[PDB]
Amino acid sequence: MSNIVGIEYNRVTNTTSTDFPGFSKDAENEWNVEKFKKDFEVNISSLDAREANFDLINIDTSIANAFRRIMISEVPSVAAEYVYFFNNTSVIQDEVLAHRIGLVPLKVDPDMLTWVDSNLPDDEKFTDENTIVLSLNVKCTRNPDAPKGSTDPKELYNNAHVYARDLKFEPQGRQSTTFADCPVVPADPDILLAKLRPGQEISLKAHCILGIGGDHAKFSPVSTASYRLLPQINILQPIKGESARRFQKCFPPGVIGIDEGSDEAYVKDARKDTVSREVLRYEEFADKVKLGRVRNHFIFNVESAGAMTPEEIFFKSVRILKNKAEYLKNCPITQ
Amino acid sequence: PDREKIKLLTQATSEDGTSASFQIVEEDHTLGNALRYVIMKNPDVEFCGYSIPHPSENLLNIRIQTYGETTAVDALQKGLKDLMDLCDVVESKFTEKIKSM
């Protein structure tokens, strides 16, 4: 047992932490930094402009899951909230178009907007520190030079497909200077917002405000933020010859390797392993292999929607956890 | 001075502390489970645990019971501070690794 999550053919064992005083007579594992500070490790496997893969090692499941939950549902992001239709003559209903525009992610960095206060009148609620205004003005006209038998609407008609790029930033007051170097643009500009035929027009502007993923999914800044426990494969007895190849076929191709000369099977990369327990259904490696998962080794994969970098999302999550802890500590307890 | 954030539930509180239920508004499993883990890593705590009484209410009742040494309020403050220190350590390690790479 002992920090390894047991992966069996019918059940999962040892999913709880058991690292607190009161678990045993030896009242060890009592909280102290300079012990967590020395044990804890961060290993960044990769870092991209939209995806981050990093390892949180020797941290608790509760803390790692707090980070994941905050990333998904508590890190703020800017999304369209109110869409004002001047004219929607297309076939898509206005409410559907508004939903799609809200689902479009904007490449506007937060901390450059202020949270909207709803305790104020609509005519004073939206400010320049508060809102991003994006306009969409697209009108479909039949292309007169359409090639013979050009069924494709792209050549048959002009502006027959509305894209997220068609949304244009309308700088308001300071926005003109604050967003001069970074004009608000859709993170994904090829999103097919709508498809129109000749005579159909779409004219709208959208008010994009800060929001919270827990409130509406459009405000969630991660396409997916999640972790997985590091898989552990223990080969208890030597497996060789052709049973070794059969053993190797029970894992993803680069997981375990075949030794040369030794001819035995050995674990080459347990990180590449999806825990499918395919080896646990064969009654010939039953006494030869032990599948597990390190309970406190987390492989975080953060994919940002496009507004911020995944490392910034993760740091914002840990800061949010710290800040709510600090706010609760400073709050006086009422009877 | 936010007096509506965390409340001591007096009906579920013992005499001379050491047992108390705290109601924390606008909190959920995120803070609840991390706080429970940290508080349980306190050698004086004999009982920690939170419940979200109803999904329709942004509410969180966290129950702390200690031995006679300290009080539940003391244990809760210690757990909050220790979570703060934990997040400090995680921030420092992450920033160092992001800088290095």
């Binding site: 991209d48 937060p110 901390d111 907007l113 949270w115 800060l210 970098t309 | 920033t95």
Partner: peptide, 17 residues
């Protein structure tokens, strides 16, 4: 990548509305 953005930038969005 591999550059801090939180140290330089004031996290205004993380304030409580």
């Amino acid at each position: 990548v591999s550059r801090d953005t939180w140290n330089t930038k004031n996290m205004r969005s993380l304030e409580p509305p």
